[PDB]
Each structure stands twice: as C-alpha cells, then as structure tokens.
Design a protein around this ligand. Structure first.
Ligand code: EST
Ligand code: EST
Lengths: 250, 250
C-alpha cells in the first residue's frame, strides 16, 4: 500500500524552493573572547551550539519532502541516525569561503590550531576543512547543498529501520522514491547550468562521493564526543546527549 | 605537472574488462564443522580469512587503473584506509543470492544467528545483510560491482593523504579524474542495458549512496575488531593488525 504524498509530484524546481525555504536559521555562539579556550571551554562552547542548532534541525526535518510521510518513529530514527552528519555538512558549507577555518558561527570562527586545544579534535577539524575545501573547489551551489543535506536525512540510516516487517518495506521504498526525485532535482539544477550530460553524471557522483566522507567524519566525530563525555568535559545537554546515547557506540 | 597514464584513455569497456580481469580469487575457510563456534572460535575463523584475503587485495589494488600512477605511500594510504570497506562490499556481493546469510567463504556460510556467537557482532551482520539484500533488490550486475569496489579504493581516504603539499594536489586530482571515468563506465554499462537517461542518473546515485552505508559499516566494524583485540580474542595476524593499527581509532 505505497501512498502518494506531495513530494513525488513536485516539479524539480518546487523541490528546491521547498528545501530552500525549509532552511533553518544560522545560530550564534555566546562565548567571551576573553578566557582562553580550554579543552573543556571549547567543547562546551561547541556542544552548546550543537545542542541548540539540533533543535532547529528537528523542525527542519519536518519540512523536508516525503519526510512526514514516514511513521513518526521512523522519522526519529532517520533524524537521530544522521543528526551529526547534518550538523557537519552545514558547517562545511558555512566554512566554504574561509579556507583554513571552520565557521561554526558568524561570531565563533576557529582554525586548524584552536582545534588542537582539544584532544583528538584536530584530525576531525582537518577532515572538515578538507571537505570544506573540496566543496569550494567544485563551486558547490546553495541549491545542490540543500539537496545533499536532504539526501543525508533520508539515506543515512534507512537500511536499519526499527522494522524489518511489511510496513517497513513500504517505508524503505518511499524514501528510495523521494531520494530518486532529489536526484532529478540535482541533475536538473546541473543542466540548468550548462553542464554536458557527461558533466551532470560526473558532478552527481562527485557530490554523492563526498557524502561517503561525511558519513565517515560523522562516525569518527561521534566516537570523539562520546569520549569527551567519558572524561566529563561535556556539558549535560539532554538533546545532544539523546542523539548520542542513540548510536550506542561503545 | 598532471601526468597521463593508461587509465584516462581506456574505453568505457576496457575499463571494465580491466577491473574484471583484475578480480582476486575467492578464498576458503579452514574450520572444522565440529567444535561449536565460540566468540573466539569464529573471530579467529573470520579474522583468518580476513588476513589472508587481505593479501590478495593488495595485489588487486595494483591492477586497478590509475592506482599505480599515485605515489607508493599514497597507494598504501588508500589501501589501508579502505581495506575493510573493500572486504565488505565483497562479502555483500557473495551473499547476494543467499538472503539471510553472509557467504564469507563457499565453505563457511553464516546466518543472523551465528553472528550472535560474538558480542556486538550481530548488529553488523544485520547491516551487512541489509546491504547484501539491497544489492540483490537492484539486481546489481557484476560489472557495476567491480566499478564500486574500485571507487572505494580510490575515494575512501583521498581527502586525507599524508600530503597537503603541492604534489598532493596533483595526486588528489588524478584520482578525481580516474573516478570521473569510472563514473562514465558505470553510466555506460547502464545505457548498454536499456535504462533511460533518468534511470541511469537515478541508479548511479542509488549505488553511490550504498557506498555511504558501507563506509559506515566499515567504521563501526573497525571499532568492533579493535575491541575484540582488546579482549585478546583476536589471533595475531600482522597484516590485519597493520590495517587496523592504521586507523588509530581509540
Ligand atoms: C561532536 C563534536 C563537537 C561539536 C561539533 C559541531 C558543532 C556544531 C555544528 O553545527 C557542527 C559541528 C561539527 C563537528 C562537531 C564535533 C565532532 C567532534 C566533537 O566531539
Ligand atoms: C572485522 C570483523 C571480522 C572480519 C569480517 C570479514 C572477514 C572477511 C571478509 O571478506 C569480510 C568481512 C566483513 C566483516 C568483518 C567483521 C566486522 C566486525 C569484525 O570485528
């Protein structure tokens, strides 16, 4: 009984202006450029931004096409299975124009060094800078971004729903369908820019292949946060703590 | 000074028969269906297969196009950054036709249960079965496979080379170039099968998106192996131990 929402009908353009209108606000950090960041100082500073930003992401999710067509539990699943990936593909986007620096917030701008203020934090920053950089090198257009962002919320953690029943397959299928359309939007947005057919193909792959690395930075970065929490350096942010105690990583 | 190898010229077809001829042999396990698998018993049984299989993978790598065009150190980097992903996209391929079971070796065939013989092992098996299953659901053709396999060896761990110099960018660029061609091979192999343009696009994305999950299973599965080694359940297989002490995961 595979239903029919709005997502599936949307014109390749509406699809865009949809995800585009959907975009959440750009938060701001509250630190005081006085006290020198300590391992703890920055962690808290970041995790704070994370936790808050995480509140808008939930709302963002609801606006993504086909997303509410899933079962509530399955929406939460997707959400908590990709939250960190999403937090990062955003960061990398914001950091596009500022090479060598990650624009966490317009008021909080860090570089490869600050990263060293926290253990193991460095490597990640570099991976984020590399992805950050790579995007810029392809001249990633804002429309493509929101497409990717959406693709993560829908792909990451789809093969692992709670279910393995019968309504699980319907769902698993709906998502695949929306994703297929998101692909059309992307391919479209690329022809609407000159790219040869060959180029469209290639650029598609190139973008999707970044999603591999992101997925990767998400795993490594998650193990990290868990560690900082085991060192009692992380503030008690229940939302962030939830999206973490969700991966059960040990 | 971006060189010009053979890879870049290859016809979309040669590209295939290249990777296809490149394929390594299908190993075999040596266990005795007598003694009941213990957490340790199977781990050793698997890790043994892993370690050995890992020997052919190295040789396989050399045969992949554009791969030897890199710097030796960079080849090792790629190799040790994706070894596990590769070991898995293979497993999943072998397990295609046997739903609910992972065909590690033609003589060693396990199911969702045996997985439970080892701690945390289960979840992974399921993820592998899901991917295993998903492939079958798309009727993944052997040619596409070898394409993916190659794409992993080249993409996974490219944004993180030793270098961040000047010869690093050349390299990083060559790979991107070969990858772009591997994309052409794929898109080609799909038109050579009827698929509309739209379908080619869509199926491309669909395959590449699996690579996200694989990357994921690789991270989680790696953390696992490290754990078993911390519990002294893993045999001392120096090659396997090398490709692990390479991720520095803690
Ligand atoms: C989760 C971490 C703190 C919060 C960081 C953050 C915080 C906010 C945000 O929008 C993106 C990111 C990306 C990387 C995250 C980090 C990865 C390592 C660290 O533990
Ligand atoms: C590395 C592990 C043992 C070896 C397993 C293997 C061994 C051989 C092979 O060809 C593929 C795989 C995939 C999953 C691997 C497992 C992931 C968890 C476990 O620690």
């Amino acid at each position: 009984s595979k239903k029919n929402s709005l997502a599936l009908s949307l014109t390749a353009d509406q699809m865009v202006s949809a995800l585009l209108d959907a975009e959440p606000p750009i938060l701001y950090s509250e630190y005081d450029p006085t006290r020198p960041f300590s391992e703890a100082s920055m962690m808290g500073l970041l995790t704070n931004l994370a936790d808050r930003e995480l509140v808008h992401m939930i709302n963002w999710a609801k606006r993504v096409p086909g997303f509410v067509d899933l079962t509530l539990h399955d929406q939460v699943h997707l959400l908590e299975c990709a939250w960190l990936e999403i937090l990062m593909i955003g960061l990398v986007w914001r950091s596009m124009e500022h090479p060598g620096k990650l624009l966490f917030a317009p008021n909080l701008l860090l570089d490869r060094n600050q990263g060293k203020c926290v253990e193991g934090m460095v490597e990640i920053f570099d991976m984020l800078l590399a992805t950050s950089s790579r995007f810029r090198m392809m001249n990633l257009q804002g429309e493509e971004f929101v497409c990717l962002k959406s693709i993560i919320l829908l792909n990451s953690g789809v093969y692992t729903f709670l279910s393995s029943t019968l309504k699980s397959l319907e769902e698993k299928d709906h998502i695949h369908r929306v994703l297929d359309k998101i692909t059309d939007t992307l391919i479209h947005l690329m022809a609407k820019a000159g790219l040869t057919l060959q180029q469209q193909h290639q650029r598609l792959a190139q973008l999707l292949l970044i999603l591999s690395h992101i997925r990767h930075m998400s795993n490594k970065g998650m193990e990290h946060l868990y560690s900082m929490k085991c060192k009692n350096v992380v503030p008690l942010y229940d939302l962030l703590l939830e999206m973490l105690d969700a991966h059960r990583l040990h």
